[PDB]
């Protein structure tokens, strides 16, 4: 009931042993009381890394999208090493979503080593299990065995109805994932451990389908974009290898489903000036001239009977002489050209009325006239060429035209393919004009280039008219164990890709949220704009060039920081060599860098002078020691990891406050939320996520089926809690419910339509479904229902929630009215109370933790000691937590080397991995999440508690308590101990 404090462990040790005499009865009692539970106590175990590789094929349907929606691929496994590195080899094949699938090396959900199907955004098929949301469900197959050498796994995905299906060795699998969210794009992905060898089969040249694709499906190799090429690449990464060494990389920009849909601008609706019958007629004449000259250059001739094979022009007249189905076609395309030009922000009309008088045409010899003769002189347009603004106009006109064409195609049902299949109603141009390659863009522009050249030749009046910050910013820093507060230090940073790089020195108190240079904590230099940032910005020197190196260096002997580029010392506007001066030591400084999307750069701390370039020019001969020179092991660094995780209420938060009033008569204990700065300057408003720190867990077995009654109180299973919404707060943007331990949606535009949901349907060999399980990361109720159920009423909205831990059902009520929304869950599941709210008044919400008649309060549910005490209580451990988007994490010292190549046309792509790697995982029981033990270096409180826990282990093991020693051998293993001794970090 009072958190994890080491002083109580000290008390327990004192109870165990004192004055060299150990009370065996007390030691056995403490051991039997706390060790067998394996809860309320930190736990560690051996794990291995898991690496996932995608096929670089993105498919997903949307409204107006060009995706086919029925895809199929195959994977072959030929080398599996069972029980490698004293752990079962991981190997899974499936599909993953582009958004939400963010694997990281080490850690993650569960105990660690998350593969595909360990998150709701991913779905995997093991040898005989279906993996979704870190949940494994056994599936029946004709051959029930794990992934083995010489095995074939066929995966087929359908988007029209949300279906994922698998097939093993030709035997179809009667377990399919259904009713999943279609937001985003889906790509193939294989997760694996060491000692694996597989080959992809994507169809066509890249792999071959040993089994025929299901009818209506298409091979995945034909979904590649025109300018894209097939190449294996990680989902996202913050590091890469290069000739100099480790090159840190920023975020990876990726396409979205909304990019596939063509979004044009309406043009035909807009009226046009009366220039159409004066000057647009001459432009149409010029187009006729140029077209006739194209045929003249070709083998075409003037034959009145139209015959493409015989090269005969139907009109066969110098003047185009085209009839209404032909002349009006030309006139209307020119008219639509002007409509598009006006719609895209430009003008239509004349500016120079003597310009067409200046135009003199180009006279050509009679050889151009062939057969009847169709040579009109090309009107010379060299008088006015295409300005860059005019070229942009041509580009936008081509975009809009191809865009309206593509939307017409999609409305007809045209679906994009890498190849051109009109019989299947598919083109390589079905992607928007922006998504086209340079060839198709050129083909859809050149004619409009001629048209705009005609426009200019006549002299026309035409004239051209929050969380994203973390998604587009990545931060790396030196570990806080190397906080130097004196001396003269040099370190170099090479920026291989030009971008908004910010490299410099930062104080140990740098918040992950604050950008570099926006605060005084870091003296950074952003050379993309060529300025230096420290609590602002100021011009400094010149921007670098792609591949330049900057020698960021500091002297606390002189209390200054300077930046040099390629051995050239950067000057300020006044000419001062030092970028900053008067820099007090304070709390010290640490190397730091900030990278943007699609950006790469090496960071050399200066460990080796031989590889330290430009040191003689910049640092040497000035008394400036290279940083980390005497380091033997590589310097450990820390990266800003973007993953939403709940964190408690900061009592010093400038905008929100939480109060804890309890013990009032006729009112249960309650936690009140207030907005400190509402109705004032800088009153930020956005969706706020809150949850209670302790969860409630359902029974492992679902073996069901005035003055409260004491027997019903003792025998009841239901639990109740309420939320009070105050007046002033709109009942529309209020939410009350429960969240799974794997909810990481930090959406500022959050909605109940954005919750993850998936239906796992299990059938038999005959195909008859017998299981219809449902999984979701959030079980919470719509706020429009509350606002409908109810000007603002002074009555505080009371939202009651009832949960049965034995039967497994969830019911919601509003102000004494029972809502129709019911929920059913599975045994052995833990849920956290949570509310999502929009600040609309000074006082908004209040958790009421109480009890009803014959209903047991949540205090019993959380606490075993109070499991039978009807009085509701709020112990200090129970706190409120909101969701932090981005935090700090520690990069691994070593990275797995997986070798992937293209074996051949028949063999597809060969992927192999045989490098072992084993770190240690520390698992939090209540939060259901794991961390590396080495990450505890910066977390001293957890380190202190763990050290005192080990001391408690020794105390209960003291004086040769051999039974307790054996019990401890179960938790703390010989291999774990040996690896801990062998560890150096």
């Amino acid at each position, epitope marked *: 009931k009072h958190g994890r404090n080491h002083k109580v462990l000290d008390v327990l040790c004192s109870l165990c042993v004192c004055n060299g005499v150990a009370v065996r009865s007390n030691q056995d009692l403490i051991t039997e009381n706390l060790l067998p539970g394996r809860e309320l106590l930190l736990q560690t175990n051996l794990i291995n890394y898991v690496t996932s590789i995608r096929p670089n094929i993105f498919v997903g349907r949307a409204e107006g999208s060009t995706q086919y929606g029925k895809w199929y691929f195959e994977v072959m496994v030929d080398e599996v090493v069972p029980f490698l590195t004293a752990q079962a080899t991981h190997l899974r094949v499936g599909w993953a979503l582009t958004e939400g699938y963010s694997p990281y090396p080490g850690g993650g959900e569960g105990w660690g080593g998350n593969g595909v199907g360990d998150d709701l955004y991913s779905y995997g098929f093991d040898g005989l299990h279906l993996w979704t949301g870190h949940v494994a469900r056994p599936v029946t197959s004709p051959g029930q065995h794990l992934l083995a050498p010489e095995d074939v796994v066929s995966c087929c995905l359908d988007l029209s109805v949300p279906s994922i299906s698998f097939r093993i060795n030709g035997c179809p699998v009667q377990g399919v994932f259904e009713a999943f969210n279609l937001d985003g794009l889906f790509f193939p992905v294989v997760s694996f451990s060491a000692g694996v060898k597989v080959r992809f089969l994507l169809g066509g040249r890249h792999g071959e389908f040993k089994f025929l694709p299901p009818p209506g499906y298409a091979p995945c190799h034909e979904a590649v974009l025109p300018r894209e090429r097939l190449r294996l690449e990680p989902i996202k990464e913050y590091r890469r290898e290069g000739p100099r060494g480790p090159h840190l990389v920023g975020p990876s920009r990726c396409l979205s489903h909304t990019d596939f849909v063509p979004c044009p601008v309406d043009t035909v609706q807009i009226v046009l000036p009366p220039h159409l019958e004066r000057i647009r007629e001459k432009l149409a004449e010029n187009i006729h001239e140029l077209w006739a000259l194209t045929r003249i250059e070709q083998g075409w001739t003037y034959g009145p009977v139209r015959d493409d094979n015989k090269r005969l022009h*139907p009109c066969l007249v110098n003047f185009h002489s085209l009839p209404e189905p032909e002349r009006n*076609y030309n006139l209307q395309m020119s008219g639509e050209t002007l409509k598009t030009l006006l719609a895209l922000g430009c003008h239509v009309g004349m500016a120079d009325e003597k310009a067409e008088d200046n135009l003199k045409k180009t006279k050509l010899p009679k050889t151009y006239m062939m057969s009847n003769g169709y040579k009109p002189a090309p009107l010379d347009l060299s008088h006015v060429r295409l300005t860059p603004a005019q070229t942009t106009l041509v580009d936008r006109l081509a975009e809009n*035209g191809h865009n309206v064409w593509a939307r017409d195609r999609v409305a007809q049902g045209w679906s994009y393919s890498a190849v051109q299949d009109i019989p299947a109603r598919r083109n390589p141009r079905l992607v928007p004009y922006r998504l086209l390659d340079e060839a198709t863009k050129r083909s859809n522009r050149d004619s409009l280039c001629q048209a705009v050249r005609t426009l200019l030749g006549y002299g026309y009046n035409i004239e051209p008219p929050n969380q994203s910050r973390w998604d587009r910013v990545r931060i790396f820093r030196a570990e806080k164990s190397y906080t130097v507060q004196s001396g003269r230090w040099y370190f170099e940073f090479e920026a291989v890709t030009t971008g908004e790089m910010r490299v410099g020195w930062a104080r140990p108190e740098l918040r992950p949220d604050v950008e570099l240079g926006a605060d005084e904590l870091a003296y950074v230099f952003n050379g993309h704009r060529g300025q230096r940032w420290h609590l602002g910005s100021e011009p400094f020197g010149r921007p670098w060039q792609s591949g330049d190196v900057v020698g960021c260096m500091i002297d606390l002997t002189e209390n200054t920081i300077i930046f040099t580029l390629n051995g050239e010392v950067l000057m300020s506007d006044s000419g001062s060599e030092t970028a900053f001066r008067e820099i007090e030591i304070g709390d010290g400084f640490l190397p730091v860098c900030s990278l943007g999307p699609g950006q790469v750069g090496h960071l050399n701390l200066g460990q080796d002078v031989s590889s330290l370039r430009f040191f003689a020019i910049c640092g040497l001969q000035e008394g400036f020691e290279p940083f980390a020179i005497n380091m033997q092991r590589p310097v450990t660094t820390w990266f800003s990891k973007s993953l939403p995780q709940f964190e408690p209420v900061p009592p010093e938060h400038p905008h929100y406050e939480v109060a804890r009033m309890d013990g009032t008569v006729d009112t249960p204990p309650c936690l009140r939320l207030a907005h400190r700065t509402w109705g004032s300057q800088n009153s930020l408003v956005e969706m706020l996520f809150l949850r209670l720190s302790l969860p409630v867990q359902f029974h492992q077995h679902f073996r069901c089926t005035n003055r409260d009654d004491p027997e019903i109180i003792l025998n009841t299973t239901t639990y109740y809690y309420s939320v009070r919404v105050f007046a002033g707060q709109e009942p529309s943007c209020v939410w009350v419910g429960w969240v799974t331990p794997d909810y990481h949606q930090h959406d500022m535009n959050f909605d109940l339509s954005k919750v993850r949901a998936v239906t796992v349907t299990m059938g038999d060999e005959q195909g008859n479904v017998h299981s219809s399980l449902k999984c979701s990361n959030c079980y919470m109720v719509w706020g429009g229902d509350f606002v409908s159920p109810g000007r603002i009423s002074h009555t505080d909205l009371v939202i009651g929630c009832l949960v049965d831990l034995a039967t497994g059902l969830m019911t919601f009520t509003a102000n004494g009215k029972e809502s129709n929304t019911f929920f059913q869950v599975e045994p052995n599941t833990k849920l956290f109370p949570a509310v999502f709210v929009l600040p609309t008044h000074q006082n908004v919400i209040q958790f009421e933790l109480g009890k009803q008649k014959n209903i047991m309060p949540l205090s019993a549910a959380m606490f075993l000691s109070e499991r039978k005490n009807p009085a509701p209580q709020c112990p200090p451990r129970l706190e409120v937590q909101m969701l932090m988007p981005v935090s700090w994490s520690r990069m691994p010292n070593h990275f797995l080397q997986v070798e992937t190549r293209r074996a051949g046309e028949r063999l597809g792509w060969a992927v192999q991995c045989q490098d072992p790697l084993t770190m240690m995982a520390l698992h939090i029981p209540e939060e259901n999440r794991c961390m590396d033990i080495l990450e505890l270096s910066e977390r001293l409180d957890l380190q202190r508690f763990h050290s005192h826990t080990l001391r408690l282990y020794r105390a209960v093991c003291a004086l040769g308590n051999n039974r307790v020693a054996h019990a401890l051998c179960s938790h703390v293993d010989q291999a774990q101990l040996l690896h801990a001794l062998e560890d150096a970090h």
Partner: nanobody
Amino acid sequence: QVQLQESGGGLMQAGGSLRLSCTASGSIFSINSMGWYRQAPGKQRELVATITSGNSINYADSVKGRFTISRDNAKNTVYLQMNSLKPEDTAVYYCNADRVPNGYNPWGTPNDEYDYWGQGTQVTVS
């Protein structure tokens, strides 16, 4: 949307009268041409004599026989009479509509890609 519905192509002895009616229902705009195509089981769709709104008829190598074509823009109806039947002539026939006129387009690839095929019908020669 411009949907072209095609009906006809009865089976009987060679030389039997076969008239195919295709009507193009859709936006009246960009309706100036009318193509025809034939593909036999297992071979490509070659162009039939294509007529455009100005009653401009373009023949090809596959017009061997009688292929009387007659169109009408009053209700976007086109009748193709391949009343001559030959063993090679057996094919699925399709009717196509497009803005491109007289099989040419100074505009370029957009309008070119602006094709609107139809449901078609089957023709067999016995």
